[PDB]
Amino acid sequence: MSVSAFNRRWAAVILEALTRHGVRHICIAPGSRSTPLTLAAAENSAFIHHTHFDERGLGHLALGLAKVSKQPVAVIVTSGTAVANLYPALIEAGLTGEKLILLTADRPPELIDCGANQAIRQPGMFASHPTHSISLPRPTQDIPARWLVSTIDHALGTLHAGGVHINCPFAEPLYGEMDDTGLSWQQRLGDWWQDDKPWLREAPRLESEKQRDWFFWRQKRGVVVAGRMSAEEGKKVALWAQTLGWPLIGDVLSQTGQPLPCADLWLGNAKATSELQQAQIVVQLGSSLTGKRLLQWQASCEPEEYWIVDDIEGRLDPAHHRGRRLIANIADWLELHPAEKRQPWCVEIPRLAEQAMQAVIARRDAFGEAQLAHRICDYLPEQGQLFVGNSLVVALIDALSQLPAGYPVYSNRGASGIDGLLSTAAGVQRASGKPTLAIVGDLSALYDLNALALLRQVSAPLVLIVVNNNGGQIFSLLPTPQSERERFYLMPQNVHFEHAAAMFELKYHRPQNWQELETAFADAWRTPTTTVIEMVVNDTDGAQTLQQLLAQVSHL
């Protein structure tokens, strides 16, 4: 009657069940109460194990792994505030669809609400942000293993997207030699242990039907808006929009190649919006649109119908247009609603976008963050991936650069948090095995500073650009009041990142001009290690350059 042994048999059923749904990566933070889960995971040869000491960073690491691999990723944490630190990544996964399976160890019910150490009320603590929530009961042999495996199989099988909170209480003793307690209990599952399928297969698909009046609407004056999607989906959307003869507005997160680049500029020109007013239908594929001018135009346009195609559920139009919400894999939906060659109807916008790109190129020389964003395509690693941070970097790349079609971009643009970008980038890199360029701001790098520990383990060179503009200079772009701006918005920390890099034995460069930045990159791509490149720029130059380019393109 060993309680510790049965705890580990119970946990073993949980972990093995996860392996039947494609869970390969598991992220583990240290703890005692989580011993059954952690030991079950450590003995299971199906898993790739990642570890970290910061549970918030651990959640974001799993988020990067799931983001890139598109598979579900498991997380194990002990009870207490460890569980609470998983909330940010769980919320982001709830918005962008990553499947995070959170195995959160818990105290047994008899140690809740009685002043016990490290014991908190854990069931339901993530409210509505998980797609599925499971509060497992106190382990007992009187509950059959087929129930437990069926519960996990239901949770994973019906998971369209988002996280699953599985709260796992365990009573002490937690340690001891394994005996035969729970062995026959496990063996009631028969040769399921030697199988590769779930015990219960419940995998219904959620998908919109094909639109039968599509061959009617494809004949009208349409606009294609491309948001976040996969790289191949970006290429397919570009070819499809070109065949329809519809203008393609491509987000930085779309890998379209942006045939009409610098939309965040030329959408501010009245000639562009006036021409767009002729559109009778807008077909948007993907969501989480980046550029402000694009969100303003989306809010202002009044086509007869507005369609949003995406594999995310729920409403995705923040302007609440009359139209359609269509849940589908974008590539499959494009096969279901194919294009037919038709003459382009736009005449003024292509010239406007060409002139906008020219206006940016004329200002490429100064050694600032706006020029860095504009020139970032010259620095993308061959056969690599781009992880773009939040705040100004993603806005400037979206507004000022033309990224190549099908070159993968990853981001945390659900909630756009600055709290997990380094640990997320580590997961992005570890998932794909590709050389990675990640670009973040100074406050973002400080926020997840300890994630530099994770970046000591990458499988290919990862360049982390930290743009140091001494604060959150997006609040120099926003019309924040000047008298409170410094103390309450920008919050400069007056630091550099050479000692942070030295602390974790990472190569570091602080280039002062373009030649030295190119030298730094040429060095950094030579080894499967993380190199930190700090670009020190004058605080408000990027914001002001963006404003000036906006005005200049508006008078075209």
Added chain:
Amino acid sequence: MSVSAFNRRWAAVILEALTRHGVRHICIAPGSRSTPLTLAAAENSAFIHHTHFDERGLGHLALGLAKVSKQPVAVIVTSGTAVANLYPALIEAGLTGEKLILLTADRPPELIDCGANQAIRQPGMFASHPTHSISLPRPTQDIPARWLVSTIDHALGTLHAGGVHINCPFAEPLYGEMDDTGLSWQQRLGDWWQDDKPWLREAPRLESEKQRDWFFWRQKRGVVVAGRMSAEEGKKVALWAQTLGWPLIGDVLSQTGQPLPCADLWLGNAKATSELQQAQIVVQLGSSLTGKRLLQWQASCEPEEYWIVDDIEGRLDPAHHRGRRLIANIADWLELHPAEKRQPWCVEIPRLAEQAMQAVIARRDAFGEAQLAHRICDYLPEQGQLFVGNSLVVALIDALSQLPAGYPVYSNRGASGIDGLLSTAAGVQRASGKPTLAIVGDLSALYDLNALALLRQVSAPLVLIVVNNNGGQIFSLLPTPQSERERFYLMPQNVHFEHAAAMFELKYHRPQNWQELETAFADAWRTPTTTVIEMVVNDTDGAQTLQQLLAQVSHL
């Protein structure tokens, strides 16, 4: 600007939006805070309005209406315990899939938690039981009508099954002359007001893929179990199982024609269960299986695979078998997995089912509830429908009768409450316009006694049989302790229902023999009115007859 007028335009957008998703029936209870909703509904010509003073019965009325019409049915109640009385019907709909749209008037936020009369905390008060929960904000023109209609359209469009809780706060004044306040706000919706589709079309379908190994499994020794489903699905399932040569165990709710009747009896015979041990796959269509012996066999059986096909989501096997949970329209699923003619493999069970039926036929003469259940087909109205109550009646009919294939049966077998059976039957009748036979126990009739008011308005004859065995005699069938049984289980109320019928001006019969029962029926089918037939039987005769028949068939 007029607050009362704008409140009514806000409500009018809500109700009009509901009409774009098939909402036709609307159930209304009286109140003051619900005035914007109730007046908007009264002015909208798309609705059939039903009224009732008991909100618990009003919810069950909406439940029966939705049950029969297969469309979402709306409910309007004022704030306070009126909302709370909707909980039972909402729970049952959450289990069996009826789409109840609950429009619950509320006090505005400034009158919550301050001692205001009839003001309670309403958002989230139904916990996880609604499929969707919408807590509308305090009405204001600063929120566009397109947002409101889009929120409703998202909720109804993605509603696969179950209830939607829409909390609707309204601030006073509620009354006053209608002026043009909010007219422009409404007109931002354009010609949507003259349209017949939603403002936002968001209607993804949830369905399992085709099982690609079905051509293997169809040739193995299978068993077909038919649970609750529609009448036409019942006929298709019967034909499908017959073609496969698999034994069909048909529930009273399956309308399959029950080709192996009295399963609750012959499943107690060791030769049957021994023959079923040879089954390699069980394919169950529908759920909420009725009989105790059937649930025990399901719990004990160990096929290689156990499948449950149904249009309800989630796990439906209370024994957690290894197998599959397939979400589909059953007719579509049968076409997707067609049968191929193979010879039947069962030898002993058909004979056992015939002999069991004969054993019931031998005891048909006594004027008791077991005989009424066994003989109930002789009282089914032509082109009518059967509504069967809970406790002993559904068990005795399931065990003792063979109901004709395709003859519609309705019930409340999700949670199996005895709290709303009369009002549910009233909704069933009003939705179909068909002559109805409804059968309930005495405690069930007392529980929903005031629903006799609703049964003063039927569009076709409805016979209500109240089996009066003086208490809940299911607790004479279960091995309840003898010393506490009467006071704490049976709870006989020692009443008759003649004065209940007279209070609501309903025809009444208390037949003493079969001939007088026939006479009561013949009188009852002649006009579109409700006739109450009270059948007085000795308390434990039906339970004992069931026990004796179980033993006798077990010794065959």
Added chain:
Amino acid sequence: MSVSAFNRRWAAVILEALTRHGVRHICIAPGSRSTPLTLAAAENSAFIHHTHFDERGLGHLALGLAKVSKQPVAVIVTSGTAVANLYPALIEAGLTGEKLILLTADRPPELIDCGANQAIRQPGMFASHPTHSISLPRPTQDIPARWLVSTIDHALGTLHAGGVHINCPFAEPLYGEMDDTGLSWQQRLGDWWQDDKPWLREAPRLESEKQRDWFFWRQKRGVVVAGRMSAEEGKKVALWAQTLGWPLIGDVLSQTGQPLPCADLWLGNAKATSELQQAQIVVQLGSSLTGKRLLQWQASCEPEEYWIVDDIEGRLDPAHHRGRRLIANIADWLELHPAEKRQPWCVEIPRLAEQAMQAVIARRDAFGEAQLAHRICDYLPEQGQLFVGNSLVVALIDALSQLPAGYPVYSNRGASGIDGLLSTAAGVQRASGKPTLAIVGDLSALYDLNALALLRQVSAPLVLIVVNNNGGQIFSLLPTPQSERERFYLMPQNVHFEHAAAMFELKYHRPQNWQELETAFADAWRTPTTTVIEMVVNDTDGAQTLQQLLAQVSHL
């Protein structure tokens, strides 16, 4: 190792624990899953057991018992919608403070969300309305009895007011002979089984401190508003306000004797409100004020300070005055803040109130509901109690009658539901053993009609007056729209209650004049039984009479 016997030991600990906190009354509805609780209660000699088949009426019966006895009252229900039917009485308990302990049987965790019959998600289903919620775990001897009893003792000891939800899962088998399973487990509590105290005494008192500036505020022009309170508290508040010389506005629920009667009438006079504008402080004792003119004056008045003294927590002023919210026993609070002799400062209001009462007396002769309310003091049983229903009756009694000081008045005026007035009145009666006068409207009587079953067992004569004006004529009182009024507001049911009384074998009178009403009362007070007195009055006479008296008193 008997699961059934241990279920009953676990339950026996729960019920015995409740007896240490003053739980004497227990209300039990029938079921199978509730067997451990029901048998534990049936075997425990500390309890008085009440039974009922309608769980909503069972909740209101417990509500009335707790209302009168000021003890916590326990309720046992089976799993499923039975649990949901307790919601209205629980909400009312959350508003007015009755201590209801809801013991709700549940299926064990392995039968949740898997299609099992009568199994729903019960933990948290009452949202925020219980003061304390306990989700008991699956019973096991690995959890010590001292944990179980300590958790119950914590919930009951810290219960200031309101309901407690104790969810109690039990796995089958539920029946079987008691053996020694769980005996030593129970015996770990030692001689606590022979004790009269809780295992854990945790009973912190919640109370506001003495107001140090009260001797300052006693000398200002104050008004005393008396809301709902106990009978003794009403008498003390009357003497206190008289000693201060402050006008006492006394609610129908205050039992103050209403020295300025017909406040709902004379508060409509400009001289009264103009005089009251001189008030620099208002001290309200109790809450849930009844009358519309009183609520309007509270909303409009702007004293320097507004105090509400009550033993209920939270804000109790729906008008949000600047001031104090003082939590205390009213009698204790009067002793901490005693009155000093001061000269009344009001001159116009006493005369106005005498004139209003005279104006009502001038209209006492017609045989209508307004006149019944005005004259109701002539029918109060000696040493008895009054239970006043909702809608017009409580408003007409409040506006037109002067009830004697200290004569007990009971009501359901938290949420003011019409859904449990009969069963509540039965509990009010059984708790005190006093002769009871209960007055309700026709829709109220229909709503809780089956509670007439409960009224077959009263310990003293109870007169139930049903005022039948054929609908909810309070909506003839409010300015509802004329063409929708009857169908969507009044909803007349066109019934009488002679057959309802006859069905439950209750004496019935339908008096046609004051003499026959007198005779009916004399007949009713002779035996400890319920007599139903139906007063048929013309639909709008009571409402209209009130409006006329309001206009006339407003113009004095």
